Amino acid sequence: TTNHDHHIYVLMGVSGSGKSAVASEVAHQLHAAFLDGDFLHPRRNIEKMASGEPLNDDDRKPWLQALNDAAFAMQRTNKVSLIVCSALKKHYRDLLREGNPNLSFIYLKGDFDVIESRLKHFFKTQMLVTQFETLQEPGADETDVLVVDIDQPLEGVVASTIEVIKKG
Amino acid sequence: TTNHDHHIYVLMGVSGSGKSAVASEVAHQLHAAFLDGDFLHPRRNIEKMASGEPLNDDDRKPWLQALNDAAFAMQRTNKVSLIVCSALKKHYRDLLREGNPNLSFIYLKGDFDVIESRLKARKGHFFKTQMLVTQFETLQEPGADETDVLVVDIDQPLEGVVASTIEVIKKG
């Protein structure tokens, strides 16, 4: 069952916002469980992503459930847990809450212009563009969402995810 | 596909041997991907365990596949990937290798008295004796026929085990 004194934090945000970097460091600094949810795609999703083609909502289905399962498993033994998932749509976001009332989100947030500059192989204008078009920013009705500002170096983004996690 | 330049290490070892703690620290010091596989059991698996009773090889099935899945996914984008998995039985290890030729094991091994005492280092932590024994009654130590398995000696402080999982990962 749910350990309402344990909590799961999902780092959301578009590709390039640095989720896995921040989350990684934040978790090594709170002796927290960390899971990069990209590792939880099924075997097909992986090949389909390597073919050049982007997944659709039906691929995402089993992916989100696994994340949901992992959240459920992480909270049994960890006070705080971090899961990385861009979770760009309300719907994916809710697919994550179903069953885990001890889950909330941390949005590493920036406007398109902010993030491009922050990246600086090579930078891909159109991938980022595609991330923003897919993104459904959490509205006010989404209250389990905490917001963090990426327009700072790593240390600060890191420092502010912590503060955000502590504040609450 | 597989990227044979990229590798996945699975730390195996009875419960209490400190895999997560080690992996977590070896990851961070190396910039690797780290998945604690305790995290990928299916919803029911958790509820079952949430009732006081262990899972059967039946239950582990879906758990091993996801790990296999996860190994497959981590190696697409990570030079080195750390997966934590007890992996007591060969077959489990077999399930893990299947499809993942770029994955080996790092057994951290000590005998009962060493895990007991390591477990007793957490103040006030109750040592569960049958639990550990079972763990040993279950493990099937990798013979020399299983060559993709390196070994690290858990009878030192957490700082060397770390240091020797690295060495071990560097050596090869």
Ligand SMILES: O=C(O)[C@H](O)[C@@H](O)[C@H](O)[C@H](O)COP(=O)(O)O
């Ligand atoms: O626009 C880009 O060139 C990508 O965003 C680039 O940042 C890369 O893909 C990340 O290393 C993986 O992105 P995520 O792990 O954040 O999805």
Ligand SMILES: O=C(O)[C@H](O)[C@@H](O)[C@H](O)[C@H](O)COP(=O)(O)O
């Ligand atoms: O005998 C014990 O008291 C347990 O082994 C104890 O150590 C605890 O459950 C572990 O800290 C969980 O860790 P594992 O991931 O190693 O199973």
Ligand SMILES: [Mg+2]
């Ligand atoms: Mg562990």
